[PDB]
């Protein structure tokens, strides 16, 4: 149960 307004599968965390 992930609650993230701007969730994206492919995001590179910096």
């Amino acid at each position: 149960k992930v609650h993230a307004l701007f969730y994206k599968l492919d995001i590179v965390p910096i």
Partner: antibody, heavy 118, light 114 residues
Framework: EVQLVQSGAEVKKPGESLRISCKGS????????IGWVRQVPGKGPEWMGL????????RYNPSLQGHVTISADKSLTTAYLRWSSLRASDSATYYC???????????WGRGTQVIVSS | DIVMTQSPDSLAVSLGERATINCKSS????????????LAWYQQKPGQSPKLLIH???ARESGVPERISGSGSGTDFTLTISSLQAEDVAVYYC?????????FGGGTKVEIKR
């Protein structure tokens, strides 16, 4: 090191168009949110929107009801904020920001001052 | 629709003393499933751009000194600066990222009391 280079200050008149820009460096630009926060002296910052350049997914603040558009060029690793018809209320400093999936803004630009006056 | 409120608007603190800034959200920003408050704190120094200080209400960014701490839960949060230094003079802003649109508090300007 993450860098967010914004374009210089702008003086314009009501009813004119404007596009300010912010080039990001030091990170995978296409796969991280980049957006804009507005600041006028009399209240706190106002969030304007974010864009995920990889797929052009754009998230706007409903309060800004179609007054501005956000876009991004992946080849230039640059984000844009555009007004088609500036109003006096648009006088503010505009910071470009980055965000992960949660919505806290972990990197901020130096800011772009925008003056709208007849 | 979440309104973020801060108090006081300006806070004067003597050097080496504690500064306590309060932030209120009109709705809870706490998720039971992950036990996290969706609350961030930013620092804007004179003539500079805001700087992320804290997220998850109490997790400091890298480089932020331990004397700067965030606490609270639900709708009431505080930022604390335990031994104020001249470099801590700034405007501090809270921000909720629990619901869109993201909204900020009005800010609290921390200054030197003499």
């Amino acid at each position: 090191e993450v860098q967010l280079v914004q374009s210089g200050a702008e003086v314009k008149k009501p009813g004119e168009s404007l596009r300010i820009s912010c080039k990001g460096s030091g990170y995978n630009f296409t796969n991280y949110w980049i957006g804009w926060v507005r600041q006028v002296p009399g209240k706190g910052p106002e969030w304007m929107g974010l864009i995920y350049p990889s797929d052009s997914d754009t998230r706007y603040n409903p309060s800004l009801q179609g007054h501005v558009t956000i876009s991004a060029d992946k080849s230039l690793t640059t984000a844009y904020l555009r007004w088609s018809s500036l109003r006096a209320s648009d006088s503010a400093t505009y910071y470009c920001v980055t965000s992960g999936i949660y919505g806290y803004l972990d990197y901020w630009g130096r800011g772009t001052q925008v003056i709208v006056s007849s | 629709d979440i309104v973020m409120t801060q108090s006081p608007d300006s806070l004067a603190v003597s050097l080496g003393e504690r500064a306590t800034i309060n932030c209120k959200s009109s709705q809870s920003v706490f998720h039971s499933s992950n036990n996290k408050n969706y609350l961030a704190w930013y620092q804007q120094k004179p003539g500079q751009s805001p700087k992320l200080l804290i997220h998850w209400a109490s997790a400091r960014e890298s480089g932020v000194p331990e004397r700067i701490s965030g606490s609270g839960s639900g709708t009431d949060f505080t930022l604390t600066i335990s031994s104020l230094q001249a470099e801590d003079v700034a405007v501090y802003y809270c921000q909720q990222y629990y619901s869109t649109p993201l909204t900020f508090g009005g800010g609290t300007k921390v200054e030197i009391k003499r």
